[PDB]
Design a protein around this ligand. Structure first.
Ligand SMILES: *[C@H]1O[C@H](CO)[C@@H](O[C@@H]2O[C@H](CO)[C@@H](O[C@@H]3O[C@H](CO)[C@@H](O)[C@H](O)[C@@H]3O)[C@H](O)[C@@H]2O)[C@H](O)[C@@H]1F
Ligand SMILES: O=[N+]([O-])c1cccc([N+](=O)[O-])c1
Ligand code: NA
Ligand SMILES: [Zn+2]
Ligand SMILES: [Zn+2]
Length: 375
């Protein structure tokens, strides 16, 4: 039965429209599991060619949603090319999302002492990157590369692969150059809209859904979410990002459910897809060797009990760094099939999350891209 869909890109491909329609239906029957660098980074994988994952080694299926970043698209591509791995995910019927950790357009020639020139260079660069600003050509260069990548991202039949493109995330904090100390709300909205327009209208991208993803709010109100929201004409997917404590985390879990309930209600009202774009125990706690061996069970229990929060399409957790990060210390979110996670109880926790009938992994999602739609 054909369903009516209103996307940011009114000329989006049939498969991109189908992805939107798929999640609109699926989200009231399950929550899909997502994982950043699902088949490109893992503690237990022996090849990074797109055929293995820590998730698969833990539970016997891949994540449903595969996350990557513009760090694998825009020069200098610090995280490496991902075209092959995206194609393998798509061939398996998976869903692809890409976040944007864009370099700082005002300071990217100055790289040398981290974090200078990167997303984490807090030098405000929104005003100077919009048209009229001195560094607008630098931002355009990044968007040119994103567009070239998208416009050539084709399956084995030569049809474009849809991607959920999550732009300028975590914008209600100030650790990125597009954040809340770096821009007024209007300036941030202009950056988001300019960038979507550039991709869609100037460069002709037809295979994106656009996602907005602020941090979780502690005062959970529609008005707060709306302050930097780019608008219904500019966003397909309403998300948020949240990282919490490894211990004494009941209040934080209640806050996860509240923010999810808010985006779910807003999304129904506005014809959007609600998601949790990024969720995890905070990296510093994981890096200290700490664990919560009930974390995944608490997550799915809390979300599915709430009549609104359960309606999110997916939740995504961050990357499983194969050798950790420089203290080397651990930096991973999917419990791996290895002695450490067997002994501390985290692998059992994740297997229980997988077993839960409301979670959806890659074999649980079918005919994502062949659903008929009208505009
Ligand atoms: C949401 O929050 C996450 C948890 O705080 C953040 O994770 C970070 O992600 C970035 C991007 O993947 C990682 O940084 C990269 O690391 C690469 C390998 O070291 C390097 O090539 C890149 O240039 C970049 O530094 C980082 O270690 C961490 O995992 C993230 O912000 C996410 F959106
Ligand atoms: O800087 N980050 O990339 C980042 C990511 C996730 C969370 C937080 N945080 O809470 O400050 C920061
Ligand atoms: Na759901
Ligand atoms: Zn239904
Ligand atoms: Zn994010």
């Amino acid at each position: 039965k054909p369903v009516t869909v209103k996307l940011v890109d009114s000329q989006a491909t049939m498969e991109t429209r189908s992805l939107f329609a798929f999640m609109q239906e699926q989200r009231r029957h399950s929550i899909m599991f997502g994982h950043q660098h699902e088949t490109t980074q893992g503690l237990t994988i022996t090849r990074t060619d797109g055929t293995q994952s820590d998730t698969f080694n833990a539970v016997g299926d891949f994540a449903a949603v595969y996350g990557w970043d513009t760090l694998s698209i825009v020069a200098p591509k610090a995280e490496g090319d991902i075209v092959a791995q995206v194609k393998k995910a798509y061939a398996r019927g998976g869903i692809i999302t890409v976040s944007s950790h864009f370099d700082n357009p005002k300071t990217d020639t100055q790289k040398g002492v981290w974090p200078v020139g990167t997303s984490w260079d807090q030098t405000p660069a929104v005003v100077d990157s919009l048209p009229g600003g001195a560094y607008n050509p630098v931002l355009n260069g990044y968007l040119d590369q994103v567009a070239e990548w998208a416009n050539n991202l084709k399956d084995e039949q030569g049809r474009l692969i849809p991607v959920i493109f999550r732009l300028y995330h975590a914008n209600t904090g100030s650790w990125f150059w597009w954040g809340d100390k770096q821009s007024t709300p209007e300036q941030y909205k202009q950056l988001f809209r300019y960038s979507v327009e550039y991709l869609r209208d100037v460069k002709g991208v037809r295979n994106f859904l656009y996602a907005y993803s602020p941090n979780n709010f502690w005062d959970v109100t529609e008005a707060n979410y709306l302050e930097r929201y780019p608008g219904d004409e500019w966003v397909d997917v309403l998300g948020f990002d949240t990282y919490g404590p490894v211990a004494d985390n009941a209040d934080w879990f209640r806050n996860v459910v509240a923010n999810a309930a808010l985006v779910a209600r807003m999304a129904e009202a506005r014809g959007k897809i609600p998601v949790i774009s990024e969720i995890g125990i905070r990296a510093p706690d994981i890096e200290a060797g700490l664990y919560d061996n009930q974390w995944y069970r608490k997550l799915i229990s809390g979300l599915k009990a709430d009549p609104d929060a359960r309606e999110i399409a997916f939740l995504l957790v961050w990357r499983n760094a194969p050798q950790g990060v420089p203290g080397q210390v651990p930096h991973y979110w999917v419990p791996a099939n290895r002695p450490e996670n067997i002994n501390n109880g985290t692998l059992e926790d994740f297997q229980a999350f997988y077993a839960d009938e409301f979670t959806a992994f890659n074999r649980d999602i079918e005919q994502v891209y062949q659903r008929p739609t009208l505009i």
